[PDB]
Every structure is written in structure tokens, then in C-alpha cells.
């Protein structure tokens, strides 16, 4: 049911036009202070996670009546790829729909193994400098 595989493809070839199945796997907000909520996801192919991705406010809604929460199942209907000043690439989420509740799939889908760090195939990249989970937690 997820979209094996749909996280590198975003992430390797570019693909921007795609509609992928993803789980939900965290999310938090991007700050704490007296400020509108801005949440960054950890999402999953089932293969693969990325904790680059940034919801579109005008989709808060989904979070603040927990429609979009840990272990749901979502499709993306439309993002875009942004790169900051440091060149990391963040998706920016601006339509989904949720297939499935967190309390529907009950549990984490697969072995899903952080984009940056290993393959598709559940392995871990060679790491000489250790420094590949910069960007996980």
C-alpha cells in the first residue's frame, strides 16, 4: 500500500509530479514560542524515512484536529522541493489527503531505514566521517 521506493525518488531523481502513499512517522513543530504552528514530518515509504519535509500551514487544520497524527496513512497530492541557504532539500507538503487514521494501520509499516543513511534494500551506507544521521534523531 505505501509507495516503496517513492522517497528516493524524490530525493534522487526530481520526480515532483508523483502522488505517493507515505506514513506518517513523527511529527513536531518546527518551534516552541507563542507563534502559529509550523510542523516538520518524518515520513515513510516503508523502505525508506526523510525528516526533511515541512507541512503548508493552510494544512495545519489536519494536525490541530488530529486527522494527520503518528502512524496514519497519507497521499500526496502536491509539493515542492526547496534547498536553504545550507542546501538541504525540504519538501514542502501543500495537499494531502489521509487514507487511513493512525488508529486504522495501529502500527509502523516495513523496516524503514533514514534516506540519508542507507539504501532501499535495508542496508546502512559506508560512513568514514560518521556523520550521515546529521540530519536524524
Given at each position: 500500500q505505501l509507495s516503496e521506493g517513492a522517497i528516493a525518488a524524490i530525493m534522487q531523481?526530481?520526480?515532483?509530479?508523483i502522488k505517493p502513499i507515505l506514513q506518517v512517522i513523527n511529527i513536531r513543530p518546527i518551534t516552541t514560542g507563542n507563534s502559529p504552528p509550523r510542523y516538520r514530518l518524518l515520513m515513510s515509504d516503508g523502505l525508506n524515512t526523510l525528516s526533511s519535509f515541512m507541512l503548508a500551514t493552510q494544512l495545519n487544520p489536519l494536525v490541530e484536529e488530529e486527522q494527520?497524527?503518528?502512524?496514519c496513512v497519507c497521499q500526496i497530492h502536491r509539493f515542492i522541493v526547496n534547498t536553504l541557504k545550507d542546501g538541504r532539500r525540504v519538501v514542502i507538503l501543500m495537499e494531502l489527503e489521509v487514507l487511513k487514521s493512525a488508529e486504522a494501520v495501529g502500527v509502523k509499516i516495513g523496516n524503514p531505514v533514514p534516506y540519508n543513511e542507507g539504501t532501499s534494500s535495508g542496508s546502512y551506507d559506508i560512513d568514514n566521517f560518521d556523520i550521515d544521521d546529521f540530519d536524524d534523531d
Open positions: 531523481k526530481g520526480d515532483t509530479n494527520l497524527s503518528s502512524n
